[PDB]
Amino acid sequence: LISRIESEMHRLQMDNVYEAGKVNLITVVQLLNEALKLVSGERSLYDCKGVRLDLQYLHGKAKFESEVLTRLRNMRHKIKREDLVSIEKIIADREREW
Amino acid sequence: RSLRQRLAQPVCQENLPIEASYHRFTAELLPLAVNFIEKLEIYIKTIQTIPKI
Amino acid sequence: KNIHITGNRHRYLEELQKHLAITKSLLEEIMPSHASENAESFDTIKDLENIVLKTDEELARSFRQILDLSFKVNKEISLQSQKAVEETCESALVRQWYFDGSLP
Amino acid sequence: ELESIAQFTETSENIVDVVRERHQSKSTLCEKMKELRQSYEA
């Protein structure tokens, strides 16, 4: 934005940002008005449409990963209440009859 | 006592004549404009990564 | 508070208006038809990442328990196999394998 | 919008690195799960 202003200046008259110890809001809005004229310029080279992020795909995968994360937790907790408790009991009841 | 002490203050030429509904947006636009002018060299990299999407 | 202001407050608004009449006009040069959908996705992206970063932990919790399940299943079968040999061979001969080498 | 497009690129590349480490960090999960499988298939 300095590399902008230094060679806009002799067409873009602008006053100072800090004047009598107070901030000049008109100068801040004039700065924003050539900062935004980078953003529109870069869109005219790299975003020549307005690209959309698909919120329904994003929420759809977020939901489905939450369901993967839940299926993994269900399998992993079933192993740790039904299966291993069946196994470790039958093992210990074999050993204590032996 | 407070109501009279506000009515007893003549229309303040050191204030801005603006309806109270707009006071938030008017005050926050200075911080928002500063933050946008400072983020400017980040946003230009974001626009140069839009082609990745 | 501490804004630089020149003369009458209406005359300052008149000049600020001539520059906000460029800032709105530049958001009209910059806002795509999907700016809101993009701006709303912000935290749905981070919750997807938060779920996926916990799916890595949970895959890594799950397989480290399936290895325990396998090891435990195999002890259940090996103890069942051992018991069948010890009840098809003579209990005096099985006793001579396991205990007569150790008996006071 | 530009905060969310930045976040989308960062998150998309983070997820493409995390799943890569889950495949390639060590044996790997993708190796040891097939070693375990082929024991019970045998």
Side-chain angles (χ1 to χ4, degrees), chain A, chain B, chain C residues 1-81 83-104, chain D:
Chain A
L1 185 55
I2 295 168
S3 303
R4 207 171 177 111
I5 295 158
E6 285 183 290
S7 167
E8 315 320 321
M9 175 170 38
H10 50 264
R11 168 174 163 104
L12 292 188
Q13 286 176 236
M14 293 181 54
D15 300 286
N16 316 261
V17 181
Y18 308 104
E19 294 187 316
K22 297 193 180 182
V23 176
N24 188 341
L25 179 61
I26 298 171
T27 315
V28 177
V29 177
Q30 287 172 0
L31 288 171
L32 182 62
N33 285 334
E34 283 295 309
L36 288 170
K37 296 196 211 80
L38 289 164
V39 171
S40 56
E42 301 300 300
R43 285 214 204 261
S44 81
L45 297 176
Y46 303 108
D47 186 17
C48 309
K49 289 190 180 181
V51 178
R52 177 179 177 271
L53 302 178
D54 195 298
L55 185 57
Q56 301 186 12
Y57 167 73
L58 281 167
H59 191 89
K61 277 290 195 174
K63 178 184 174 289
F64 192 64
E65 268 287 323
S66 199
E67 290 168 311
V68 172
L69 186 58
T70 298
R71 279 171 281 149
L72 291 173
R73 282 169 181 157
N74 289 340
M75 168 173 27
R76 192 179 67 70
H77 208 340
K78 175 259 177 190
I79 289 169
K80 217 94 198 168
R81 282 181 179 151
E82 290 70 61
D83 304 314
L84 286 171
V85 184
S86 181
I87 296 158
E88 289 176 19
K89 181 184 170 185
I90 291 166
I91 285 168
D93 283 341
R94 293 250 182 277
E95 290 176 284
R96 288 180 279 90
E97 187 59 32
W98 182 70
Chain B
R1 199 188 176 298
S2 190
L3 294 160
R4 188 178 196 158
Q5 280 211 236
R6 201 177 181 99
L7 282 172
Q9 289 178 77
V11 180
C12 183
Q13 301 185 16
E14 277 288 271
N15 287 29
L16 259 170
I18 304 180
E19 181 196 324
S21 62
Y22 297 113
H23 283 200
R24 179 177 174 165
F25 311 109
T26 307
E28 284 185 318
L29 181 59
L30 171 59
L32 185 64
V34 169
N35 195 314
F36 195 100
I37 294 160
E38 286 169 0
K39 283 186 171 193
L40 181 60
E41 282 193 45
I42 308 176
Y43 292 146
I44 289 165
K45 300 180 181 78
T46 309
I47 298 157
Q48 291 168 9
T49 59
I50 285 173
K52 296 195 184 190
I53 290 168
Chain C
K1 184 170 162 286
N2 297 329
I3 306 295
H4 198 94
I5 297 181
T6 39
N8 182 326
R9 306 313 197 83
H10 296 298
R11 282 258 62 253
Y12 189 81
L13 281 170
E14 272 186 64
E15 254 70 287
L16 184 59
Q17 188 174 342
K18 292 172 193 80
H19 291 299
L20 290 170
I22 299 175
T23 320
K24 166 171 174 298
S25 187
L26 278 166
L27 295 161
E28 295 173 354
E29 205 185 65
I30 288 169
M31 287 282 286
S33 49
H34 306 293
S36 218
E37 298 184 273
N38 289 359
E40 287 159 48
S41 75
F42 191 39
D43 302 291
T44 300
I45 296 160
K46 298 169 201 156
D47 204 36
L48 171 61
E49 197 172 1
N50 263 273
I51 295 160
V52 171
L53 285 170
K54 294 163 194 59
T55 305
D56 189 76
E57 298 193 305
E58 213 68 48
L59 289 170
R61 287 160 179 140
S62 299
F63 190 71
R64 298 185 203 122
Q65 275 187 223
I66 297 165
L67 289 168
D68 184 37
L69 183 70
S70 171
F71 171 64
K72 297 270 180 63
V73 161
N74 296 352
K75 190 183 182 205
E76 197 183 341
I77 305 310
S78 292
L79 284 175
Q80 185 167 270
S81 191
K83 180 176 165 62
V85 183
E86 298 185 8
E87 273 149 75
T88 48
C89 296
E90 289 194 307
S91 63
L93 212 177
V94 180
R95 171 228 168 74
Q96 200 126 116
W97 296 336
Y98 296 162
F99 324 125
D100 290 317
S102 62
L103 262 171
Chain D
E1 184 214 318
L2 298 173
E3 213 96 313
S4 306
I5 290 168
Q7 186 69 80
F8 180 80
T9 56
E10 186 169 60
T11 295
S12 72
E13 291 177 292
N14 288 348
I15 290 171
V16 169
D17 260 72
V18 170
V19 176
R20 192 193 312 136
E21 268 291 86
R22 188 46 55 201
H23 280 68
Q24 298 185 19
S25 69
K26 291 177 174 273
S27 43
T28 86
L29 175 60
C30 311
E31 291 172 337
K32 187 60 166 175
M33 188 146 57
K34 291 172 188 55
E35 187 227 275
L36 182 64
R37 168 186 282 278
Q38 287 179 346
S39 200
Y40 290 94
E41 294 171 351

